[PDB]
Symmetry: D2
Subunit: 292 residues, 4 copies
C-alpha cells in the first residue's frame, strides 16, 4: 500500500493568518499535523528519558509524540503563552502510557535555560535524549529595520541557549545518550529577509559538529536536523512575511510544504541507539530543496 508522497499531506494554498509570536498552533488553519493520528512506535526508545525544547508545537511536538510512542518518558519546555498546546502534548504522551513533564520558561533567561536540564532529569528520573528544537524566527526584509534587540534575542534563543543547555547536560549524560539539534535549509541558503535567523541556523549546525567531536569520547552523540519549509506556528507568527504564506512550500520539488509529522522519523533514528555510527551529521527534510 504505497502512497504518493507529493499528495500525502495538504497541498492547497494556506489561508493568510497571523498570530503574535510564538503562536498557538491549535489556532492555525489548518492545524499542523504532528503525527498525533499516524505515528506508530516499535519500542526503539524503550525506557529512554527525553527533554524536548519547543515540545508544545510544530517539529518539537512531533518529536515528543514519537518519542513517547517509541517508549520514552518526555519532558517538554515551551513558553507560558503556549500552555494550551503543551497540555495537548501532555495528554498525547500520557496516552502512550508514558510520563509527561511540563517545564515552561523562557530560554533567553540563562539561569532558566541552565536550570532546565536539572529540573527535567530530577522529574524524569534520568536523562538520555535531548532534542533541542525551540527557535525564534522573525522576517525583516530590509536591514535598516532589523534592530539590535531582535538580532541579539534571536542569537540568545537559538545559539546561546543551545550552549547553556548542552554545557549543563554533558556532565550528566550517560554513555549512549543522544543530542539532536535543529538547523535549517537557511544554514546553506540564507534568505535576505532572515539575516539574523539564518546566521543562527548556521551557528547551530557548526556548534553541534564541534560539540560532537568533543564529546564522542564520553559516548555521547550529537547530530543535527535541518528542515525545509514546514507548516508551523513559527511561520505564521512573524517567521514569514504575510504575502509568502499562501504558496508556502510550493517552490520545493515536491510542490508542497512539509508537515511536522514528517520530521519525527529522523528525530527517532538519531535518538535511537541504531544510529551508533552517526555523530556530527546533518539530516535534511526539505521536500527536495536540498542541503549543501
Amino acid at each position: 500500500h504505497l502512497y504518493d508522497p507529493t499528495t500525502q499531506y495538504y497541498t492547497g494554498e494556506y489561508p493568510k493568518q497571523k498570530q503574535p509570536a510564538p503562536g498557538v498552533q491549535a489556532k492555525m488553519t489548518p492545524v499542523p499535523d504532528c503525527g498525533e493520528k499516524s505515528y506508530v512506535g516499535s519500542g526503539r526508545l524503550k525506557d529512554r528519558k527525553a527533554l524536548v525544547t519547543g515540545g508544545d508545537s510544530g517539529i518539537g511536538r512531533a518529536a515528543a509524540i514519537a518519542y513517547a510512542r517509541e517508549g520514552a518518558d518526555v519532558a517538554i519546555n515551551y513558553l507560558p503563552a503556549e500552555e494550551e498546546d503543551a497540555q495537548q502534548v501532555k495528554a498525547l504522551i500520557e496516552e502512550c502510557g508514558r510520563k509527561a513533564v511540563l517545564l515552561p520558561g523562557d530560554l533567553s533567561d540563562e539561569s532558566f535555560a541552565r536550570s532546565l536540564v536539572h529540573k527535567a532529569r530530577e522529574a524524569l528520573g534520568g536523562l538520555d535524549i535531548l532534542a533541542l528544537v525551540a527557535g525564534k524566527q522573525t522576517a525583516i526584509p530590509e536591514i535598516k529595520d532589523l534592530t539590535s534587540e531582535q538580532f541579539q534575542q534571536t542569537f540568545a534563543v537559538n545559539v546561546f541557549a543551545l550552549f547553556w543547555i548542552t554545557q549543563e547536560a554533558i556532565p550528566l549524560l550517560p554513555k549512549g545518550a543522544s543530542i539532536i539539534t535543529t538547523s535549517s535549509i537557511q544554514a546553506y541558503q540564507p534568505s535576505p529577509h532572515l539575516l539574523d535567523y539564518a546566521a543562527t541556523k548556521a551557528a547551530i549546525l557548526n556548534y553541534s559538529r564541534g560539540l560532537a567531536k568533543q564529546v564522542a569520547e564520553k559516548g555521547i552523540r550529537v547530530n543535527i536536523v535541518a528542515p525545509g519549509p514546514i507548516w508551523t506556528a513559527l511561520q505564521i507568527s512573524g517567521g514569514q512575511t504575510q504575502d509568502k504564506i499562501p504558496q508556502f512550500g510550493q517552490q520545493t520539488p515536491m510542490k508542497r510544504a512539509g508537515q511536522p509529522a514528517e520530521l519525527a522519523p529522523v528525530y527517532v533514528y538519531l535518538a535511537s541507539q541504531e544510529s551508533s555510527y552517526v555523530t556530527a551529521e546533518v539530516h535534511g527534510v526539505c521536500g527536495g530543496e536540498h542541503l549543501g
Copy 2:
C-alpha cells in the same frame, strides 16, 4: 539498556590481509558484521519489493538483510566470484520468511545492467525500492600508476551503471517508490590515493540530487547514503593500501571503523514511506568524520 557507541563494535587493530577484488567477506578477519544476528524489523517495508546491488556483502548486504527483516522481498546483484557470500544472503532473506532472488552479473556491461531491472521486476512481481550499493574502489597513491582502463572502469561501475539502472527503472516505478544511492565521505574529502573513486562518489551524489528533482513529480524519491570508514571487503581487496588497514577507522572521532550493520537503519529510513518529505538528501554515517 544503553551502550557506549564507541565500544559497541570491533575496536582492535585489523590484521593486514589482502584478497583479489571484489573479495569474499567470509575470508576476512574479522568478518564484517552486517546485522545478521542483531537487526530486528517492525514491518516498515511490508510487502515492498527491493533490488540491492552489492547485496552479497558489506553495506549492500546489511541493507538487503534489513529490508527482508522489515518485510520486503529482495533481489540482489553481485559478481559471480561472490556466489558464496550471495548464498549466505539468500538464506538470510529466506529465514525472514521473504523471497530472495539472486541475479549475478557485471554492472559494467551496459546490456546486463539495463536487463537487471527487468529481471528483478519479473522475479519479484514488481519493484519499488532500489538500493544501489555496488562499487569499485582501487587505491593508487601516484597518478603515474593510475591507468586509463582503471579510471574508466571505476566510472562504469559506479556512475554509468547508476544511470543505466535508474533510466530503465523510472518508467516502471510506482508512486511511492524509493531509490537510495551510495556516495562516501570521499565525495567531500577526496583522498589523494583515490582520484577516480572519490570523483565517482561526488558524481553519484550530484546525479542523485538532479534525478530526485526530475522524478519528484512522478512520486519517486531519490536519496543518498555517504558512509565513512566501514570495515568491508572493498577495503581489503585493493580499496586501501595495505599499511592503512591496521588503523583503519581509528582517526574518526569515535576511534573505530563502522560495521555494515550500522548502515542498515538509514537505508530502511529512506526506503520507508516514513521519509515522505525527504528527497535529494545525503545522509552521513561516518563516526564523526562528517560530511560537508
Copy 3:
C-alpha cells in the same frame, strides 16, 4: 570611477538562437564579451607558459586573453569547426605582444588529449599554467531521452580528458606550476535537465581537490573555478533548452547573466604565484547564485 556591477554588463533579455554544438561565438547575438577591450595586465604572469582548453571562445577565451595580457605565452585547444573564433584569439594574444599557438583537436580522443600537453610544451618552450575549460553540455529534460552515447561523451570531454591531460602533464610541470579546472554552480545545485553534465561538474571539482593533495609535494597547485550563468556558445548550442534563453541569468541576485570577461580575474589570481597558499579550493563567479 566606481561602477554599479548590476548594470556594468547587459541586463536585458536574449533572443532565442540555436547553433549546432559547439557553436561559433562570432555568430551569437549578442557576441559574448571576453574582455577584449577591457582587460589590463600588470605582468602577474610574465613569461609564464599556458595551455588553455576551450581557449577559442567563452570563459576559456577570457582566460587566454587575460593570460596574454598578464605576460604569458598561450597555447589554445578547441575543435576545428571553431577555427574562426580561434583565429580571433590568436590575433588578441599577439596584440598583447605574446606568442599564440593554436592546437585544434577533439579531447574525447585519448591519444589527442595526451599528445596536446607535449605539443603545447614543445611549441611554447615550457609549460607552467594549465587552464582546463573545455566542456560539453546538453540539456535533456526527461531521462528517457538521455542516451548512453551522450552520457558517456559528456564524461569523456569533461572528466576523462581532464584526467588524461593532467596525468600527462604532472611529470613535466615545474615547481610553481598552477592547474585551474572548471566546475559550475551545477556541482552544488544540479538541474534536472542536466543529469550527466552536472554530475561531471561535481566529478571535476572532486578530482581537482584530490589531485591537489597528491601533487602538493611536487610544488604544483590545483584549483577550481565554478561559474554561474555566463552568456556563451555552450548555452545556445544545446546547453540550455530554448525556452530558458530569453531570461538567462535574470534569476541571480544581480539580475543578469555574467559575461566571460568577468571570469578572467579569478583565472589570473589562481595562475599567479600570488595564490601560493591556495590549493584544492573552488571559486564561485555566479552573480550571487552562490556555491556551497
Copy 4:
C-alpha cells in the same frame, strides 16, 4: 622565476610562546610576514577608500598594506592596546603615498562599532571598501571550562559587530562598494577546542551571503575570505592551546602554515571592481585544507 609555494615560507616548528590577548605581533618569535617587503600594487584600487578592522596586525594588516599599495586610502581599526603594531601600519600606508587613518576602539561596544563607519568615511572623504577582519578566538578544550562571558564576547566581536558595522554602512555605501568579511576553515571543519569561535565563523559566512542577496540591488557586493592556519598573534594570545603551537600548520597538504602576506591577493581581488560578478562567495586560503 617560478617558486615552489610549499617552501616559499617557513615550514618548521614554532616556539611555544604566549601573550595576553589580543597580542602584539611585533613581539612574536617570529613576527608574521604581512607582505611589507613583497606586495606590489598595480593600481587596482586607485583612489578607493577602505576601512579595515583588525588592520594593525595579521591578516587585516596584510589587507591594509596591499590596499594602500593598490592605490587606496586606508583607515584601520584595532584595539588601542595594539598601538605598537598599528603605528607600523600607518607608516606602511603612508610610504605608498596614501592617507592613513588610525581609529582604535573596542568593537564589542555597539556605540563605538556604529560610530566607526562614520568616522572613517569622514576622515577618508568617502568609503567604498570594508574589510572586516577583527576577531576574537580563545581555545578551550573542554566545555566545562567555556564561560558564558567568553561565549558571548566571541559572538559580540565576531558576529554582532559585523552586523552593527554593516547595518550602519549600507545606507552610505555607493554603487560599486565591496564588503569583505572573514570566516575560516573552522566554519566547515569546527575543532572541539573552538566551540564558540567556530560557530561565529559559520555565522559570519552565512550572514555575509544573506546580506549579499539583500544588497545586490544597491550595487554593493559582499564576499567572504576563509583562511586556514595562518601564523598570527591571534594564535599565540590564546587562540590555540600551547601544545598546538609547535606543529601549527604542518597538517595541511602544503605542510606549513600560511603567512598573512598570502591572504592579501584575495582581499584585493574581492575589493577590486574586477570581481563584478562575484557576490555571496567564500574564498579559501588554506594550504590545501580546503573548504566545502
